[model samples]
Target: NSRYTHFLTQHYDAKPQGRDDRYCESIMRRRGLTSPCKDINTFIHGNKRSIKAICENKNGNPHRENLRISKSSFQVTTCKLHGGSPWPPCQYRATAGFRNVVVACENGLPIHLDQSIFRR
Candidate 1:
């Protein structure tokens, strides 16, 4: 259990069951990530081991000092607030993609997630 395990559990899931708008709303409702609109979030569905392995620094490419971009592409569900909401009625749209994921690491441990974008 790392300090950022909460982050991993919150945003990462090995088996995501298609996080559509309804699922997004429910997650926001339960987690209370925010009120009205949760802004934006992308839920990753992949192996934590591989994601964490990015920090190994030898296989995956490094974005900078403590940031690493995974050598693999991950399936994800991106949720965007589409319209009004104050709790049980928050509206969201879920977009899906498979792309390389990036994260910030501290001492070889991933502590934060970065965007899923890269060249080539």
Candidate 2:
């Protein structure tokens, strides 16, 4: 379940305030996910169990064995590279929206986030 754990470490956010460097930076530091600049990442806000249910969603992906497409849209915060190198001091611009997320799951847990989009 390391991948699932990593997925949570990288993506989950129970409560999200408006986008701010201080908050995003702290998340990066605390999660140890800042190295090499993630380029772009989306943090979905909700209960963990609700997100996990996407694996069994009627709209789930069938072509891929482990992929799932969330039928419901979620409030999401997306961070995009804003400045600095891919190394240290990597900067980001965080924006929030409602979107559907795509994830790869196993054992009813999300192991990876494939993408998030503003569409059903």
Candidate 3:
């Protein structure tokens, strides 16, 4: 009970997900490499928006190609403005798209470069 109380009362600093340097450090340790990062921002910026195409296909899904990248296994999520609803943020997901993102590591060599557009 005391532990739970302490946990509830403790103040926490919220850090953005996947931005911690430890992530890179861990990759380095696992890969047995001295340098885990070649060029962090340059890599992310160069590949994050490398989309082959964006099209609307109503066969399997209507909100197709909303967010997709080429030659990488990542999910796509579609967004749009809400129907005059001010309670939520300006952007809303009228229809959602799903794709599985697989991040593979070979001997700690990270094959996936994940850079989210929503991140600062």
Candidate 4:
């Protein structure tokens, strides 16, 4: 199991403060799992507005040459809603110094990987 092996290498003896955060540390450590972000209003708004703005005016194709008119421009919606800093790799999920679990799946096989939310 390369996933489990990598898991051990990443966090066999990691400090239990931030990683697992709960009783499941014995199974896997430092796997980088994290809770979803808190707010999503911006994402919703950006989705609605971007779609409407880009397509409503079906005249001279104001969005053809503008990359901002693409779906990716709405990325800020997810980032802001997820408590992500204006940086790459959104630390709100799977941040450094955090621990997670190991889940592996084989070719065309179903792996039952379950995790309970950690509440402080």
The per-model lDDT (C-alpha) reads 0.70, 0.75, 0.27, 0.26
On lDDT, the stronger of 1 and 4 is 1
Off by over 4 Å in 4: 1-42, 46-50, 58-61, 64-90, 93-120
Per-residue lDDT, model 1, residue 22, is 80
How far is 14's C-alpha from truth in model 2 (Å)?
0.4
Q: For residues 38-98, write the lDDT of model 2, one tens digit per residue.
A: 7777788988877887888554554355568888788887777777678868676767778
On a 0 to 1 TM-score scale, where does candidate 4 land against the true structure?
0.18
Candidate 4: tens digits of C-alpha lDDT, residues 1-120: 564344233323322333221323221223332232222111111223333333323211332233212222322111122344533232332222222221222332112221221221
Instruction: Using lDDT, give the best candidate's number.
Output: 2
| Clash count of each predicted structure | 0, 0, 0, 4
Model 1 residue runs over 4 Å out of place are: 84-88, 116-120
**Number of the candidate with higher lDDT, 1 or 2:** 2
Q: lDDT at 101 for candidate 4?
A: 23
Q: lDDT for model 4, on a 0 to 1 scale?
A: 0.26
RMSD of 1: 3.5
Ranked by lDDT, top first: 2, 1, 3, 4
Give the candidates in order of TM-score, highest first.
Answer: 2, 1, 3, 4
The digit string of per-residue lDDT tens for model 3 on 11-66 reads 11122124234433333233332332222221121122222111112111212233
Which residue segments of model 2 deviate by more than 4 Å? 58-66, 116-120
Query: Worst lDDT window (10 residues) for model 4?
Result: 37-46
Clashing pairs in 2: none
Candidate 1 whole-model C-alpha lDDT, 0 to 1: 0.70
